[PDB]
Amino acid sequence: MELTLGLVAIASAILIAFGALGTAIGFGLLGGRFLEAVARQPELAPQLQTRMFLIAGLLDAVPMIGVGIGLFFIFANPFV
Amino acid sequence: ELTLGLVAIASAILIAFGALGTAIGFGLLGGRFLEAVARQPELAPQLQTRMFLIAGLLDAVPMIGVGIGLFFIFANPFV
Amino acid sequence: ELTLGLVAIASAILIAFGALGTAIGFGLLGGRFLEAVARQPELAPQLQTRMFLIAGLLDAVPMIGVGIGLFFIFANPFV
Amino acid sequence: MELTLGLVAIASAILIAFGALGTAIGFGLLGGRFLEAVARQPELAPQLQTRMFLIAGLLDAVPMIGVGIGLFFIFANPFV
Amino acid sequence: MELTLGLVAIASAILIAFGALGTAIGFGLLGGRFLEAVARQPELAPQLQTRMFLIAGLLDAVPMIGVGIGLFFIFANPFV
Amino acid sequence: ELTLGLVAIASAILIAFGALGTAIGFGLLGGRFLEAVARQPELAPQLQTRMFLIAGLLDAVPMIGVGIGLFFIFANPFV
Amino acid sequence: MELTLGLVAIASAILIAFGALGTAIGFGLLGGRFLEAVARQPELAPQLQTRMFLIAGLLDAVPMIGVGIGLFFIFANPFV
Amino acid sequence: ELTLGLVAIASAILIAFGALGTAIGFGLLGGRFLEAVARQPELAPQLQTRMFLIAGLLDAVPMIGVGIGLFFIFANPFV
Amino acid sequence: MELTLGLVAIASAILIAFGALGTAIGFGLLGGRFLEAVARQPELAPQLQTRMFLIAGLLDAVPMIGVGIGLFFIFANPFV
Amino acid sequence: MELTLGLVAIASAILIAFGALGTAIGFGLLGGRFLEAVARQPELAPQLQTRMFLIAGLLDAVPMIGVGIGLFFIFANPFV
Amino acid sequence: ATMQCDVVSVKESIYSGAVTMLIAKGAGGELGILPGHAPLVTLLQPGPIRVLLENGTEEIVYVSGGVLE
Amino acid sequence: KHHLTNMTYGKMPDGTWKLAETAEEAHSMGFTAIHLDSMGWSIGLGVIFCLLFWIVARAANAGVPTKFQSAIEMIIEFVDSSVRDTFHGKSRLIAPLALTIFVWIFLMNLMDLIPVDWIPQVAAFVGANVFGMDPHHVYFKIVPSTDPNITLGMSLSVFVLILFYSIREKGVGGFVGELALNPFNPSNPVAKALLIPVNLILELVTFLARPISLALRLFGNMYAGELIFILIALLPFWIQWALSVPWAIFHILVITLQAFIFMMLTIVYLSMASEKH
Amino acid sequence: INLTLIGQAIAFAFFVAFCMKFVWPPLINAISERQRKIADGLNAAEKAKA
Amino acid sequence: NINLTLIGQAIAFAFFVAFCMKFVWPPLINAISERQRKIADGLNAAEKAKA
Amino acid sequence: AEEGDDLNRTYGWDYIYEPEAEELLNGLLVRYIESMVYQGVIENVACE
């Protein structure tokens, strides 16, 4: 019982942690190349920004979905 | 009792690792996409089609992990 | 009893590591693919052909691992 | 109970640790490209700086979220 | 005896998993530069493709061996 | 008793991951920084000031974690 | 002694797994630049291939050693 | 008893992660530094000074963790 | 005491595993640039080839130190 | 005390393990650019080797320190 | 050592001789040139060129746009 | 406080007030497939959207636009421009459904800016006058529609439309036939592992996961944001709530981004289903 | 959370309504700007007539 | 307690509206006004054009 | 213009183009055409 609760806490922690680790590097990788692109073609800022936001929305899905189940486990968990 | 916690750990791994993979793959793809579009702006739609073909081919296996994880969470074997 | 949980962990690892590998692989492959096709917009078809060839060559071991994982899920040994 | 306390402490530590690890790499990856870009077009410093702040705000969301759950665990923890 | 079974299962999973992770990274890393090479000089496509196959056949050797040991643990395992 | 060791190892992880992140991040930043200043030596002060700005922006979360680790060290909960 | 057998299996798995993981990434990283070099200088293929064999044989030495220790544990291990 | 082993593990983690971070960071810095000084040999001393500035800024947090590790080694709490 | 034997086995396996993984990545990272350079300047092949062994001998120092202790644990282990 | 001995052994192993892992990648990353630079400016080879020695000596300090702690654990350890 | 440097305009040759070093501003940025350099070609910003003789005397030539080889 | 805080975290995440036929309102324990009282409040927010657009729609005039109709003109022209320049080939009310879903999800997400407890605690008044206090204190009130069922029903309709345009190829067999990531694996035991399981996994993953991904991505945003807001509410005495204002500014930033991403990817998927041959 | 299929049922139903039922007043709206462009092109042609 | 907590949240919306004006209102208002200006100029040109 | 040169005697080295080769080629071509025009004017002066 006690061990079950501890393992639930651990699993929930991993769910948040790996998602944060993924997104924090993905956004950096995207933004660096974005800055290079906008620097080379300064007049194309708005369409480049739109393409960016499309990418970013398409990017963060799986990890930050896992974040949701993590919070689910935090507060309303099965197995009890 | 221990089996429940272990299944919880396994499920967490299932979503988390695929998530970590996708979060990096999409960034790596999008960076080159942004460089490509800025260099040949009039070719944007073709590049977008190629890119979404790539994304559809890519995100498959992490979805497979997510599905098995969700299956574990609600209706799991080993009970 | 613990055998069930450990088998669950093993199955989770099998799927997770393969997904993590494939997501990175296709991402960094597609980035280079988009960079290349931008250079030579006319040369798209055989580029896609080579890319699909190597992609099919790529997923071999991850697919092998996924099958073993599902085998563990449904009808595992050690029971 | 004791084991639960230890395990939740571990989970809390993981929550902050992975977020810090992710954000440290992300900011470096963004900033290197930023510094390269500003040198190539020194006139465009303000707008590029604004875009960099936009990316930075978009980036560290999830790690900052995880910091919240970490502080929650350290101070007001469930499972007690 | 149960612990032995579980640990054998874990070891088997590790054997295939790490090899798959390595192969997936290596194949893509090779393929990106392969695409650049073939796109820059499309005339040399068969020769370059042959060289890439040579490299690949030299690549997956150790992971392929590891998969065999993993499956060996699966079907006919020692230590029993 | 077993609590105390877990507290110690958690505190160690807190500092360790932050240090690992900062070491790689500062190297990644400084690489481009040095590469940039050599290209355009006349811009050294402005680029250096920007580097201080972004460096201060960088190490925030690791420094936050260090304080939590130290709090675990000296006067911790769970007692 | 059961846990000893299990941990021996785990260790043997790790030995082969990490070696395969390293070799797979290393060969791909090498072959990418190799393909760029062979494309840019098509007249230079043989001596570059010779260099690549030299450095490849120089590469997988330690992972091959680790495979040996893994097999050692598999067939006849100490600690019995 | 077990607490002592856990403290040992934590101390090892502290030192090991710091060493791993520093080794990668300094290499990443040095690659770009050598490339830059190769491009512009005249400006070697100023770039060298910029090195030590950024490197002293870099190695801080791992050095902080080293002290904590040594503290756990010699005079540890939790006893 | 059996537990100690298993743990020492794990530690020894880690010793070789991490060293092999590091060396495999390092040699590939070096060889890529080496091949690209020899493509750029085929005239200076012997000099570059000398430098590459110089640094390679400078490279594997720490991993070879670890492999020695790893082999030391296998046969003549302390703690017994 | 047995479990304490095993954990101390694990700690001692991982100490030098991570150090080797770091050094192997670091030297490779440095040497790649070193060879490329010396190819670009073949006249500066002694000066480049001086700078490379300086930075290499500055690099491996922390892993070498960790090796010392590891050896201390191996021969004359606390926790007895 | 020394290497043959020729600075020629569209009308006539301006400077010539053997020099030990050259400094110019390429499209990417400043460039240092020493004998045995790998082949390279850029476009020069409208700035002066500095060449260092073996004796230590340094001639300077003003160039407004052009190609460096 | 601590007991009160735990009770509150029991309260706010109560699913749709969980009404039930052949039963009372709720007992926080039913957990059956029964009535839901949240998306009714969501429709109460969609209706003002339709009315606001109908206001301009009935007023058909080409004169100088006033501020409100100028802004609505911005919105309609922007969504039309996006749909047009990005996507083409054929048009059956695609841009209308796109503009509806965009604004509808945006307004749903917008409601989060209100405080965590102001509406439920003002609802203590209607608890006092009718239905008592304790029934309000078990589970009675709901927050903006952040529950996963809303977004799941939302996404599955898009999936149905994907099916409807995916049968436009005039044959189920023609559409089902598609290119596979796994055309071949020569090895024989590998073929055993490949034939049934891997291909079944492929046909599962190819299309089915995507609407789930959409629904869960939106759900994560909503639920994480709201839980952050509840968690902030502690230790009020000596503070300026600096943990809230910048965070809610970022929340304002992410709201429009999420709505935009949902709309854009939906039109993407419809365009893909509309691919020729 | 909980499935509670009632929520998703009402969501789909009211979505299909609130969208198809009021696609039409939007379809009205596309024309005004387009005809404004008509006006602003014809007033461009008038000077050529001059 | 409960009301005292809501007192801080009163400060919240105060600062939200304060920052909403200074930052968000000028750009939207300027966009509206400018698009109105170009529409008005385009129609007035047509008016003198018909004359 | 005598493009047959440097095909049999060409070596296995290329430059290190600081800009992309396309822009460099355009910049070379413009200046080359201008120089052709100039040295065609000078010959006309001598003929005059």
Numbering used by the authors:
A (entry chain S), D (entry chain R), E (entry chain J), G (entry chain K), I (entry chain L), J (entry chain O): 1 to 80
B (entry chain G), C (entry chain H), F (entry chain Q), H (entry chain P): 2 to 80
K (entry chain e): 2 to 70
L (entry chain a): 15 to 291
M (entry chain b): 3 to 52
N (entry chain p): 2 to 52
O (entry chain g): 194 to 241
Recite the paper's sentences.
F1Fo-ATP synthases are large, membrane-embedded macromolecular complexes that harness energy from the proton-motive force (pmf) and use it to synthesize ATP via a unique rotary mechanism. We solved the electron cryo-microscopy structure of the F1Fo–adenosine 5′-triphosphate (ATP) synthase from A. baumannii in three distinct conformational states. The A. baumannii ATP synthase has a subunit stoichiometry of α3β3γδεab2c10; its overall architecture resembles that of other bacterial and chloroplast ATP synthases. The rotating c-ring transfers torque to a central shaft comprising the ε- and γ-subunits, which protrude into the α3β3 hexamer, inducing conformational changes in the F1 nucleotide binding pockets, thus converting the rotary force into ATP synthesis.
State 1 was then used as a reference to build structures of the remaining two states. The central stalk is rotated by almost exactly 120o between each of the three conformational states suggesting common stable low-energy intermediate states in bacterial ATP synthases. Structural alignments of the γ-subunit between states revealed that the three states differ by almost exactly 120°. In F1, we observe the canonical “Walker-Boyer” state geometries in both the “open” conformation (βE, “empty”) and the “loose” conformation (βTP, with bound Mg–adenosine 5′-diphosphate). As in Bacillus PS3 (10), the third β-subunit (“tight” or βDP) is in a “forced open” conformation (denoted as βDP*), and we find only weak map features in this region, which we interpret as a loosely bound inorganic phosphate ion. The A. baumannii ε-subunit is similar to those seen in other bacteria, containing an extended C-terminal α helix. While the E. coli subunit ε bends here and protrudes “horizontally” between the αDP- and βTP-subunits, A. baumannii ε continues further upward into the F1 head, forming two more helical turns followed by a five-residue extension, which forms several additional interactions with the γ-, βTP-, and αDP-subunits. This may further stabilize subunit ε in the inhibitory “up” position, which blocks rotation in the hydrolysis direction, while still enabling ATP synthesis. The A. baumannii a-subunit contains an additional loop extension between aH4 and aH5. As the a-subunit loop insertion is conserved within the Acinetobacter family but is absent or structurally diverse in other bacteria and the mitochondrial ATP synthase, the unique a/c10 interface in A. baumannii represents a prime target for the development of highly specific inhibitors.
